[PDB]
């Protein structure tokens with residue numbers, strides 16, 4: 501029995517949702533995503549691994565007066581797209597970049613209903629921006645920046661303590677990508693990694709350092 505889905509308030513209009521999967525090392529590993537409340541509507545930033553937890557997360561907010569306006573998945577792995585099938589099935593708009601949908605399709609997974617490309621994309625005009633620093637953890641990974649609170653959701657592109665699974669990683673490009681991220685969001689007040697506790701802009705530096713170390717230690 502895996503731990504129960506958790507939903508904790510991180511900042512005004514921002515919640516961190518946490519779900520868990522069983523791996524082959526850390527046994528049970530926590531996966532953090534967010535929920536951004538704009539007006540009386542909620543935007544899911546990454547989905548839980550399963551339909552069960554995505555449903556629990558959706559209903560938690562629906563029962564509090566919030567309509568689910570949509571979800572955005574930061575990379576193709578289930579940790580971020582596990583709930584797209586369920587959300588699609590409820591006609592809740594789901595978003596992913598073209599690269600992500602291509603990896604999903606290729607992996608025989610259901611794709612986001614709405615796609616996008618380019619370095620940056622505003623999911624919600626001046627409130628939720630999606631940024632692509634380039635390949636790192638996976639070919640498609642993106643981050644989501646909330647300008648108002650200065651919060652950066654890094655998903656698993658932010659690896660401040662070690663890079664983890666390199667299976668779909670691009671070790672030679674990760675450094676460049678992390679440099680661009682660090683220059684782009686040095687102003688973040690909070691950086692939310694997928695598997696670790698929340699931190700400040702230092703996580704961008706630390707991620708860069710691990711990426712560099714990883715490239716060096718590869719050749």
Ligand SMILES: [Zn+2]
Nearest residue numbers: 575577579656
């Ligand atoms: Zn991943």
